[PDB]
Amino acid sequence: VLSPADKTNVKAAWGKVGAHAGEYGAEALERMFLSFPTTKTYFPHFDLSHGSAQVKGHGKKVADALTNAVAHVDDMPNALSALSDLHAHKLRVDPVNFKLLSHCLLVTLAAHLPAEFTPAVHASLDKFLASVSTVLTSKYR
Amino acid sequence: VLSPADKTNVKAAWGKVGAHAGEYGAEALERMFLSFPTTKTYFPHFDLSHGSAQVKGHGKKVADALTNAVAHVDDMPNALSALSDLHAHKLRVDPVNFKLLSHCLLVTLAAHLPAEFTPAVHASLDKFLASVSTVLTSKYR
Amino acid sequence: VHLTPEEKSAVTALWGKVNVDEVGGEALGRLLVVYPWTQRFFESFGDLSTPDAVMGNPKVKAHGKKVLGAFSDGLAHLDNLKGTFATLSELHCDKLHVDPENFRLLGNVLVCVLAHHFGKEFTPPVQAAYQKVVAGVANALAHKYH
Amino acid sequence: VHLTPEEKSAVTALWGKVNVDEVGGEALGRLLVVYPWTQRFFESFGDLSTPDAVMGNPKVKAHGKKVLGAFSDGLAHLDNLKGTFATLSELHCDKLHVDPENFRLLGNVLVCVLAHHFGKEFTPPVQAAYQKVVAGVANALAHKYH
Numbered sequence: 242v243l244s245p246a247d248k249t250n251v252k253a254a255w256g257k258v259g260a261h262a263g264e265y266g267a268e269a270l271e272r273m274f275l276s277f278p279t280t281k282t283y284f285p286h287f288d289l290s291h292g293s294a295q296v297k298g299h300g301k302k303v304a305d306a307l308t309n310a311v312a313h314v315d316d317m318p319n320a321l322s323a324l325s326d327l328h329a330h331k332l333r334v335d336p337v338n339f340k341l342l343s344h345c346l347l348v349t350l351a352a353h354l355p356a357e358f359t360p361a362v363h364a365s366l367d368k369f370l371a372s373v374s375t376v377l378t379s380k381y382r
Numbered sequence: 383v384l385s386p387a388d389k390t391n392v393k394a395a396w397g398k399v400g401a402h403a404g405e406y407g408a409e410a411l412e413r414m415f416l417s418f419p420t421t422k423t424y425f426p427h428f429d430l431s432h433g434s435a436q437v438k439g440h441g442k443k444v445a446d447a448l449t450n451a452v453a454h455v456d457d458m459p460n461a462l463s464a465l466s467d468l469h470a471h472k473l474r475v476d477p478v479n480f481k482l483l484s485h486c487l488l489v490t491l492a493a494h495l496p497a498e499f500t501p502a503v504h505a506s507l508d509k510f511l512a513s514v515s516t517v518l519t520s521k522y523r
Numbered sequence: 524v525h526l527t528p529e530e531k532s533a534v535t536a537l538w539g540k541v542n543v544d545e546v547g548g549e550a551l552g553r554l555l556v557v558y559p560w561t562q563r564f565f566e567s568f569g570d571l572s573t574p575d576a577v578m579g580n581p582k583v584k585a586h587g588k589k590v591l592g593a594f595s596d597g598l599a600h601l602d603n604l605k606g607t608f609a610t611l612s613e614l615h616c617d618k619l620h621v622d623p624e625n626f627r628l629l630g631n632v633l634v635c636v637l638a639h640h641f642g643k644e645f646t647p648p649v650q651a652a653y654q655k656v657v658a659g660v661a662n663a664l665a666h667k668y669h
Numbered sequence: 670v671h672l673t674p675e676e677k678s679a680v681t682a683l684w685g686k687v688n689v690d691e692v693g694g695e696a697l698g699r700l701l702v703v704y705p706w707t708q709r710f711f712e713s714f715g716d717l718s719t720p721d722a723v724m725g726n727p728k729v730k731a732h733g734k735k736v737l738g739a740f741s742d743g744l745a746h747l748d749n750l751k752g753t754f755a756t757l758s759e760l761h762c763d764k765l766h767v768d769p770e771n772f773r774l775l776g777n778v779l780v781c782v783l784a785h786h787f788g789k790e791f792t793p794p795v796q797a798a799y800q801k802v803v804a805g806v807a808n809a810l811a812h813k814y815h
């Protein structure tokens with residue numbers, strides 16, 4: 242449901258991020274584990290304390306997967322087919338938690354990219370993050 | 383998305399509803415208004431009392447749109463286009479209430495179809511309803 | 524939760540004809556068929572391929588006996604749900620790592636079953652009381668989730 | 670709601686440096702923009718078609734000024750959020766007919782506005798303390814819904 246004005250926005254603000262993606266992703270989780278303790282359940286084999294390398298290493302993957310989606314924003318179902326299967330049959334994360342991350346992500350983009358975080362872009366991204374949550378869970382049943 | 387089987391089961395559970403559709407849709411409404419009072423915020427113009435001509439008439443429309451969705455499950459976006467626009471631009475109901483109306487619709491079908499309502503059919507009806515929820519809110523932004 | 528004296532009597536009346544052990548295996552099996560992503564905890568249960576395999580698994584059935592048992596014994600302390608489940612709440616978080624959402628999915632598949640089980644007797648006013656009760660039981664299990 | 674010593678000191682210290690008339694105007698505008706269907710309760714507000722409009726609309730900015738105002742008043746009474754909004758809850762339900770869900774959306778848009786305004790200062794622990802206040806205040810408004 243992303244209008245042209247939407248892809249231009251998403252691409253625009255995700256272009257400014259650039260190298261910082263890893264750092265940014267890493268913070269989105271820390272805000273998630275602290276603001277929504279029930280998402281800590283999916284990581285009982287991690288060390289969730291501030292500065293955890295594991296959390297920074299995971300954020301990196303998550304963020305690269307979004308950069309990958311922003312590139313192939315026209316054909317996501319396929320660029321993300323391998324991730325979709327992984328979350329559907331192996332990780333089995335309840336669909337709800339996808340909303341908590343998206344939210345925690347946008348928050349991390351505002352406290353870092355204030356000039357480009359206009360109410361227009363703000364709405365394009367949320368949709369974007371929604372659109373990725375619709376794919377990553379498409380095959381749960 | 384759906385599977386060839388889910389369709390056969392949907393066309394099954396429904397094919398048995400027959401002429402109890404408008405009446406089953408009426409029960410599903412009373413239930414939703416009782417187990418979830420927050421929904422009565424969308425009907426401040428109705429007489430929400432047992433038997434109401436308004437609540438019954440409505441239950442008839444709702445089901446009929448479902449009977450139509452089932453007939454064209456191989457092509458739902460097209461068939462519910464008129465309602466998509468209606469919900470997205472006029473009524474404007476929070477996408478969360480669609481899930482509540484869905485729960486009350488399964489409770490009804492189960493209390494009325496003892497023989498048919500099997501685990502595999504239950505699974506399919508729940509998908510179908512959510513698939514109907516996705517089309518009606520697809521144009522929200 | 525806060526049910527009226529008439530709503531509580533209702534709950535108890537209908538639960539006096541519930542075969543706790545059968546409904547247990549029907550509730551826990553249906554939770555794993557409609558929402559397969561719950562199966563993530565029962566790898567050590569064996570065959571969970573088909574709905575029949577899931578519905579005829581002696582382990583799923585046995586676990587259902589437990590769940591709906593601990594559930595049924597909580598109907599005697601409707602006025603103190605948290606107290607009664609304060610320990611299982613702690614356990615599900617720290618050692619089981621079970622996402623609290625699951626108690627909401629199970630609480631709804633429990634309502635659809637009692638509906639399929641009692642038919643016309645499972646009336647709208649009766650359903651609500653049960654909805655308040657399952658929510659209340661879910662809320663209590665997720666009370667000590669740090 | 671319940672907040673620890675460190676949390677409450679984080680929530681307050683920060684709320685002391687907030688122009689309640691700027692954040693409220695902003696917050697209500699974005700709610701209307703990011704989640705359009707919430708534009709339903711405001712027909713008599715004028716032009717809302719473009720975001721540039723919504724944000725420059727005086728009636729929308731005037732409202733947000735009063736809403737976020739009544740919000741600060743409860744920030745003084747955290748230990749009793751339910752009794753502090755007892756009258757407003759009734760109002761929103763009975764005469765306004767506003768689906769409580771809309772208190773959950775505003776609460777999340779309000780944390781984004783705080784993170785956009787303070788930047789780094791809005792550290793993860795701080796935000797955490799804020800997700801609590803909002804959800805709390807949210808239940809408090811939805812508390813007297815029938």
Ligand code: HEM
Nearest residue numbers: 280283284299302303306307324332334338339342373377
């Ligand atoms: C924007 C949404 C999400 C994206 C794009 C994403 C992406 C990924 C990626 C790239 C991996 C690494 C796969 C590999 O090891 O090769 C992964 C793994 C994982 N994800 Fe997600 N994920 C998302 C949401 C979620 C959510 C909401 C949760 C949390 C409640 C979750 C839990 C996990 C877990 C537990 C793993 C495995 C961790 C490990 O490597 O040990 N993911 N995800």
Ligand code: HEM
Nearest residue numbers: 421424425443444447448465473475479480481483514515
């Ligand atoms: C499976 C989902 C749903 C279906 C198939 C559905 C279908 C319909 C239909 C067929 C109409 C009749 C429009 C006309 O008269 O031309 C309509 C109107 C309406 N719907 Fe939806 N709807 C659904 C969900 C919802 C939900 C969840 C709510 C809200 C809690 C809702 C609230 C309304 C209202 C307020 C009306 C207008 C009543 C009036 O005529 O004044 N709908 N819907």
Ligand code: HEM
Nearest residue numbers: 561564586589590591593594611619621625626629660664
């Ligand atoms: C109304 C809710 C429920 C109640 C009353 C409940 C109760 C119990 C009880 C009595 C135990 C045994 C604790 C012990 O080992 O000492 C337990 C264990 C467990 N429960 Fe729950 N539970 C509930 C819902 C669920 C659900 C929905 C899931 C997850 C999707 C779940 C998964 C488990 C697992 C994995 C164990 C351990 C399995 C085993 O060792 O046999 N429970 N629960």
Ligand code: HEM
Nearest residue numbers: 707710711735736737739740757765767771772775806810
């Ligand atoms: C943190 C939450 C909120 C607080 C503390 C709050 C507070 C208030 C207060 C103080 C009034 C003013 C009554 C008057 O003097 O006329 C009011 C009215 C109203 N609120 Fe809220 N409110 C909240 C959220 C919302 C939301 C999310 C919506 C809808 C999307 C909403 C819609 C309205 C409307 C339309 C009015 C009535 C305007 C009129 O007709 O005069 N409020 N609110």
